[PDB]
Amino acid sequence: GKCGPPPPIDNGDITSFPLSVYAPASSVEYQCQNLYQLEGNKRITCRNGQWSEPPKCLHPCVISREIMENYNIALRWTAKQKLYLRTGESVEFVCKRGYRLSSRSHTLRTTCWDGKLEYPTCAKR
């Protein structure tokens, strides 16, 4: 019950060189590009001529200084200048002088997920 080549994944690849045919019970492993986060089983196995479901590579986020300025917020730790955030990594923002966390805002601490970072808003005080 041999299987064909392992499926491709965005922003990731298998750790071994791909072959056109794999024997039953064979397995290969994926890893994602730098700063991308693996979701699901990193290993896949050939069972009954079919590969098990491959994983995803979740996107990192980029902290936009443009969005921060527009939202009247700033980074709490500015010497530790993080540009990227891994999925699952969080950041702490502070209001800029003259503003306060707004009513309908996300918490000042926020976690990147698959490229999506929710910036908090601070309103005029």
Binding site: S102, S103, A123
Partner: protein, 292 residues
């Protein structure tokens, strides 16, 4: 290119004013990428997400829709002429991106017409917005009646195709506001006002003769409308001007203006960037639609 402006995609947050501040960059980003058809390189997958941030902003804004159909930062705050007009401006451009309830859009238009227009055509603000940085070159303006009247007029006209049938009074209100701008256009001093009122008149086909001549001669090096002060204001003013030029189909005057906007290498976002961001990408998107 789309990469220089990926930061324009953002989650909308805050009250009646800040929510529109957030909704702004995402709406104009999708609008401009649709037009220049760049989702291919940028990432087709990224679009549907942006679309639901837009739907989200819209839905969140409805929380600040007052029974009058007008808007303010808070439901307990007196409605703002400018903010309501701006919501119309933004929603009008987004009707082909998401599902906008016409009763919402046309309700706001009607309220502007029935409550906030003066007998001589002027539109009046009775409750200024808190975040003055979101109104662009309108902020500190001598020629405020003209500037605000033009701003509202532009919103009404961009809401016209959608709301004309449900709002009999729209063309009448438009005409009357047009009368005021025309009667006072020649005495304008600031290039900002000349550009925004210019666009408002152009949409009407009433920017001509001496008015048209003033509009064109007001520019510097025939490639920008500028006033001493915040540079973002000039980007905004020149975007309004470009849109006027496109409305005049004066495609001979366009190239240097478009070039200057590009040479500005402005990519939106930042403090007090709302008007500049919306206008520059509305203007450049319109250029691509029309050219040549």
């Amino acid at each position: 290119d789309a990469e220089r402006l990926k930061h324009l995609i953002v989650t909308p947050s805050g009250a009646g004013e800040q929510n529109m501040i957030g909704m702004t960059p995402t709406v104009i980003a999708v609008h401009y990428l649709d037009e220049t058809e760049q989702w291919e390189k940028f990432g087709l997958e990224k679009r549907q997400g942006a679309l639901e941030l837009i739907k989200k902003g819209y839905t969140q804004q409805l929380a600040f829709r007052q029974p009058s159909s007008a808007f303010a930062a808070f439901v307990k705050r007196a409605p703002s002429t400018w903010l309501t007009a701006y919501v119309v401006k933004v929603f009008s451009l987004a009707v082909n991106l998401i599902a906008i309830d016409s009763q919402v859009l046309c309700g706001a238009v009607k309220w502007l017409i029935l409550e906030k227009q003066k007998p001589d055509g002027v539109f009046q603000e009775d409750a200024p917005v808190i975040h003055q940085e979101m109104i662009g070159g309108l902020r500190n303006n001598n020629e405020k009646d003209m500037a605000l009247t033009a701003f509202v007029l532009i919103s009404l006209q961009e809401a016209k195709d959608i709301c004309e049938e449900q709002v009999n009074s729209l063309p009448g209100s438009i005409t009357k506001a047009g009368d005021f701008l025309e009667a006072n256009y020649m005495n304008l001093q600031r290039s900002y006002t000349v550009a925004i009122a210019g666009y408002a008149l152009a949409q009407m086909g009433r920017l001509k003769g001496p008015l048209l001549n003033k509009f064109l001669t007001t520019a510097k090096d025939k490639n920008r409308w500028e006033d001493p002060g915040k540079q973002l204001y000039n980007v905004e003013a020149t975007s309004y001007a470009l849109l006027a030029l496109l409305q005049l189909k004066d495609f001979d005057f366009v190239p240097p203006v478009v070039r200057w906007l590009n040479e500005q290498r402005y990519y939106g976002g930042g403090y007090g960037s709302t008007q500049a961001t919306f206008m520059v990408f509305q203007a450049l998107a319109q250029y691509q639609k029309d050219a040549p």
